[PDB]
Symmetry: C2
């Protein structure tokens, strides 16, 4: 439920970035006191690949900016809805 | 620095509420795993007392909404600038 709290913050942070259509997948693990995480976000299927890349970079900045204990975050995208 | 992280989140959360002119004072302590906190915010001296009360209630909701481990938060206001 400690990890629940952190994963909740990650999802909420990702969801507040323009162009995110949900968090499809989030795997977060402690490496010592640090979090390493891999994330898949949904995006508009009609976004370009370049736009999807930009959204991913924005999520990475947003999430890392808000959740200081994260020391690695890999964000990919999939078409949603 | 664990407590540093939580106090940083409290200040940032308070500062993002309309009408907050800085956090003047923040005393936060662990009661078990929970945080109990007392906060003074700055507000516009020309706000009414009722407006200051509203800002305080907004800060309380914002901070408690964002920082789940807080189980008590008392917010007062003082004139700033």
């Amino acid at each position: 439920s400690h990890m629940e709290a952190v994963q909740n913050r990650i999802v909420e942070a990702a969801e507040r970035v323009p162009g995110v259509r949900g968090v499809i997948h989030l795997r977060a693990r402690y490496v010592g006191q640090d979090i390493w995480a891999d994330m898949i976000i949904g995006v508009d299927p009609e976004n370009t690949v370049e736009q999807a890349h930009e959204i991913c970079e924005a999520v990475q900045a947003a999430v890392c900016g808000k959740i200081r204990r994260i020391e690695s975050l890999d964000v990919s995208a999939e078409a949603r809805e």
